[PDB]
Amino acid sequence: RRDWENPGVTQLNRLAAHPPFASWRNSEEARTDRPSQQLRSLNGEWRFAWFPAPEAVPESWLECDLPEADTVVVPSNWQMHGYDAPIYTNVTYPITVNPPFVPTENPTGCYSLTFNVDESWLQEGQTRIIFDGVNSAFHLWCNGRWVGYGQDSRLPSEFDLSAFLRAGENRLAVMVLRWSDGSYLEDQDMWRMSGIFRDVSLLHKPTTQISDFHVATRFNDDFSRAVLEAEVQMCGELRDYLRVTVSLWQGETQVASGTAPFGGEIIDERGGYADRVTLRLNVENPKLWSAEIPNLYRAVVELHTADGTLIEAEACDVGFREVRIENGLLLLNGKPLLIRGVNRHEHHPLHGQVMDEQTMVQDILLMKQNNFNAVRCSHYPNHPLWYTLCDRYGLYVVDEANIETHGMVPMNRLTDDPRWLPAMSERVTRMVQRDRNHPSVIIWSLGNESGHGANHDALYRWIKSVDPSRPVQYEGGGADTTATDIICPMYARVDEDQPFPAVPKWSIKKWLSLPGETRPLILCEYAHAAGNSLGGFAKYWQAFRQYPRLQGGFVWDWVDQSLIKYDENGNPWSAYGGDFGDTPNDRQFCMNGLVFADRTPHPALTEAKHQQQFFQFRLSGQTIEVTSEYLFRHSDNELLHWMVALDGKPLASGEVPLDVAPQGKQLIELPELPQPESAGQLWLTVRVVQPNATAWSEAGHISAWQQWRLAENLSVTLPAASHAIPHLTTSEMDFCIELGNKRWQFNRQSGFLSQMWIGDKKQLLTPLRDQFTRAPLDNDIGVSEATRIDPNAWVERWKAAGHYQAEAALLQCTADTLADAVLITTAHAWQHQGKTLFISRKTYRIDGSGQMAITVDVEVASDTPHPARIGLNCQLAQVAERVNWLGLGPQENYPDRLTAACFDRWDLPLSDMYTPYVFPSENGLRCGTRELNYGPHQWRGDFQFNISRYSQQQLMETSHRHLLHAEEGTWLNIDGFHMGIGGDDSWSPSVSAEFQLSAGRYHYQLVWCQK
Amino acid sequence: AALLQCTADTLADAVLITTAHAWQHQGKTLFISRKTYRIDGSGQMAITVDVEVASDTPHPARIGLNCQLAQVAERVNWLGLGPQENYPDRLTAACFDRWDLPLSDMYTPYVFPSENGLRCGTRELNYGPHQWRGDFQFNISRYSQQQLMETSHRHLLHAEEGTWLNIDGFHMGIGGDDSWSPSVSAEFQLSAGRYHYQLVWCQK
Ligand SMILES: [Mg+2]
Ligand SMILES: [Mg+2]
Ligand SMILES: [Mg+2]
Ligand SMILES: [Mg+2]
Ligand SMILES: [Mg+2]
Ligand code: NA
Ligand code: NA
Ligand code: NA
Ligand code: NA
Ligand code: NA
C-alpha cells in the first residue's frame, strides 16, 4: 500500500498522544520522580541491516535475524555509523518535489531486537512500546506479526503490544524509511539523517488506567492566591469504588490534596464525561515559577479504590505561572518579559541528532551563564528531557510543531491545501497533548517557514481553543498574519526597512506602530551568527530596552552544525555541507552558532552575554547607579566589584554588596579617589559577581560588567633630548637609516620599508605595505558562488572593483635629514584598469631615541566600494609566545561588536589571538589598542590589529580550518580603521552605514620601537 | 596656550616649522595642538594640524584656526557647500559647487549676535590674494568671535579693521530640538578625542 507516499495515512494502530507516563505502582516514587519498574528502556545494542529500498528487504527478516546484520547502538542516526551519507541542504528539498511521492531508491534501515518480557507483564494489564523518535517513517512487527505504522520524526509513536508478546524472548522488527510523504513537512535547514534516533521503551499500565491529565494554574489579581485544576481521564472499566487523588507537594511538604470519584460536570444535552474528573486545589501565597526563580511543586495523580488500594500513579513538575498578552505586552505573572533567547537545534558533532542528558545540561548551563533566559525549539518538538531540564533550571520555551515546507513554491502550497490539513494537524495536536503540562513552555509555535495557509489559521484556533494558557505564534507569511498573537519576524532590522513584496521585513520599531497594529514583537530569529558575526547586536538591545512592545528575540543560532570526520591519519576535523559526497548541498551555511559543535564558545557569545545583562549602570560623579532588570528576584547573590586603573595600572578597587529589588535601583558612591601621578586615562570598571554557587553557575561567576572613562591627564612633558642622531645612507636602490644597533631599509623602487635589523638579525620576511582588503567573512560573502555570483555581496563588489588585485604605483619617495632625525616621505597609488582606487601618503620619522613614527594619510575614491580596512601589514621574521597589548579585550572584537570588550592591559599566548572559525576568514582583531607588544617590538597609537601565523591570503584561499598551515614568522595587521562585520542576516549586505569606511580621507599614526 | 615645542628644519626644497601647544586652565590640560608648517619653493604653505582633547572636558564648539587678515576684499569665492550659511547638522539644503558672493552675505544678521556664516565641506576658499585649500568649514567677516559674543544687539556691531577668518577642521552641531537644554545630537559633538586636518595656504 506504500503508506509512506500518502499524507492521508500518517499512522496505523498508533495509540493516543499524552503527557509523559511512568505508571508508578508506589506513590512515594512518583512524588520524588524516581525510576519506575514499569517503564523499561530498550536502548542499547540492536541488530541493523541497510537496504537501498523497502522492496529489497527479505521477508525472512520478519521471522529471524539476518546474518548480514551488524550489532549497533540505539538510539542513533544510521548516517553516523556510515551506512549512507548525511545530507546538508537548506531550502531545496533533498528529494525531487513531487508530493506525495518519494524516490523509489529509498534508504531503508532494518532494526531488530530480541528482548525479554516477564509473564507478570502479560498476565495482567497493557504493555506498549514507545518510540520517542523515528526518522522519518516506519512499520513495526512483533514476533513476525505486523503491529502498526507511524510518521512525524519528532514525537513519540506508541503501540499496544499486549496481544503480540509472549513470556520470555520476543523479537521486534522495525523497517525505517528515510523518505516519506512526511518528509514534505520536514524541510528544516539542517542535516538530513534518519533512523531510531531517540529512546525506545516499554511501558506497562494496568487495564484500568490514567490515560491523560491536564494541569492548569489560575491566579487572583496579585498572584497571592491560586487554584490548581487537574482534569484526569481514565480508560478501562468504570466502577463506583474508583477514585482519583491529586496531591500537591513543595519539597517534602504536602501543600494540598483532593479526592473524588469519576464523573465530570454536565457538558451538553447528552450529559458529561463519566470517565473524567477534575480536582481543584487552593494554594495560598504560591511560590511562582519563572526563569529567574524556577520554583516547582510536584503534582501526584493517584488512581485507586475507595478502600485505599493504589492502582497506579502518574505525576509531573508544576510551575505556578500565568502567561498572557495584555495591552500589547507579553506578561509572565503580570510582568512584561524581555526575551533573551536563542534558537537551538538538536545537534551533536559525533552522534548527529541523538541527544543525551550531558549535552543538554551543558547547553543549558552555558546559556544561563551567558544571560539567556529563553530558547526556541527550532523547529520541532524536542527530546522529552529537554522540557524537564528547562522546567527545573529555568528557561522560557517556545515549543514548535514539526512542520516546515520551505522548499515548496510558493511556500504555502501545502499549508493552504486542505488535503494536507490532517497531516499538519497531527503534528500540532500531538505536540500540545504531550507538552502542555510543562511550565517552561510559555508559547506554542505552528512550525517554521511554510508560508501562510488556511491550515495554519485552523490549527491556530484549535490551540487557542484547547489551551488558552499560552499564546500562539507563527512567522510564516509575513510574521504578522492572523495565525500569530506575536509579531515574530526573522532578521527584521532595527531601523532599516526591507520592503519585500507580499512579505516585507519592516524596521522593528516601525512595525509596532503600523496603522492598527497592537501586538508585541519578539523576533523568532535575529542576529545571524555565521562565523565572525553579531555585528550590530547592541543596536537590537538598545531598542529592546527603550521600546516596551519590543520584547526581545531568539538569536540564530546556538550551535554550529558541523560533523566530525577523520583524515588519512585518523585525525578528526570539522566537516560541513558537501564533505560527505552529499550533493546538492549548502556547504558551510550549516554553521552559524554562538558556540562550536563541541560547545566551545565563539567570540560572539561574550557580546551576547554583555548585551543581555540583567543589571544596567549609570555614572554621575562618584555615584554609580545600578538598576535591576529582574522582574521577580532581589539581588540576593550579587556583590559589585569596582576597579580604577590608569592605562591598565590598578590604582584603587573595592566591593559593595548589591541589594536591589526587581526593577529597582541602588546608588553606590565611590570613595574619594586619589589623583594619579603620571599622565594618562583613568578607567572605571565594575562587575557583578555571584559569591555563591547556583544550580547553573560556580561561585565567583561574573554576570555583568561595564566601563567608563574617568579623568584624563594629557601628557605635556617632552622626551629628553636623544644622545645620538640617525644616519642616512642614500643609494640608487635604497634609503638606509642607521642608529646604534638598529637599521631601517627603504626600497626606493617599491617605496616600502623592506627590512629592519636589530643587531644583525633581520626583523621582516615581507615588506611593510598598505592593506585595504580582508579575507572575506561569511557576511561579506553572503550567498555568492563561483557558479552563481551575487554582485551585491561585499566580497563581489571588492573583487569587481579590483581591491584584491590592485597594484601599488610609487608616486614619490624622498629622504630628508632633520636636526635630530631622518624623514622618509612616500606616496603610492593603487590602481586597477587605469582606475585609481586608493592613494597612500606617508612619512616615516626615525629619531635619536630609536623610535619610528609613521604618519599615514589615505584617499579613497568616492565611487569605489568602501574598503574592508585601511592599514598596514607585514610578516615578522619572529615567532613569540605571548602577545601583550593595552586596549580592548581580551577576546576578539570588531568595530560593531566591541561593547563586551574592556580597555585594559591584556596578555595572551599567540594562539589565543587566532579564532578557529571552521570556515577561515579575517579574525582575531582587537580594537581601540594604544599599545601592542610582541617579541622585541612595540607599537603605539590608536589602532585595531590582529596577529597570527596565517596570512590574509591563506585564510581567504582555504576552505576548512584544519587545512591551514602556520606560515614562517608572524603576520601582523595593524589597521587605522576597519569595517564592521555586520550580521543582521547572511545573504545580503548587513554592515550599518556608520561602520562603513566612507569618509573618503583617512588619517592615522603609529610609532614603532624596540620594547 | 603654553608652548611645548617650536622647531625649524631646512629640507631639500623647503623649510619645516614644527610646533606643539597645550591649552590649560587651573593646571588642567584641555587641548594639545601639534602642527607642522611646510613652506616650499613654490610659495605654498602646507599646514598639518593634530589635536588632542581631554576626554573629561566638555566637547569643544570647534577645532580650527583663526586670524585677522589685514586686507578687506569685496568678494568671497569658494568651492564647497553653499551658497547660504550651513552647519554640520544643518547642511542638507546646501549644494556643492563654486560659489561667489559679496563679503556682507558671508555674515548672517541675527538680531542677537553669535557664531554665524559658516559654510561646510569646502575644498577651496578665495579671498583677495589668498587661497586656502583642504577640506574644512569656514566663516569670514568683519566681526571677531569676541565682539559677537560681547555684543547684545546686531545694530551695536562695528566692522573691525581687516577681515576675521575662522577655518575649522571640525565644528560642533548647532542643535535646536528645543532651546532650554542641550540639543546637539551625539553624532554632531566633537568627542573623537583626536582630530586631524590639513590646509594649504598660498597666493593666487
Ligand atoms: Mg503516509
Ligand atoms: Mg519463547
Ligand atoms: Mg527553512
Ligand atoms: Mg560599555
Ligand atoms: Mg542631500
Ligand atoms: Na522592550
Ligand atoms: Na545557516
Ligand atoms: Na546581594
Ligand atoms: Na576561506
Ligand atoms: Na551676543
Automatic annotation (TrEMBL), chain B:
Substrate binds at W180. It comes from the Bacteria. Residues 1-202 form the Beta galactosidase small chain/ domain. Homotetramer. Belongs to the glycosyl hydrolase 2 family. This is Beta-galactosidase. The chain holds residues 821 to 1024 of 1024 of the full protein.
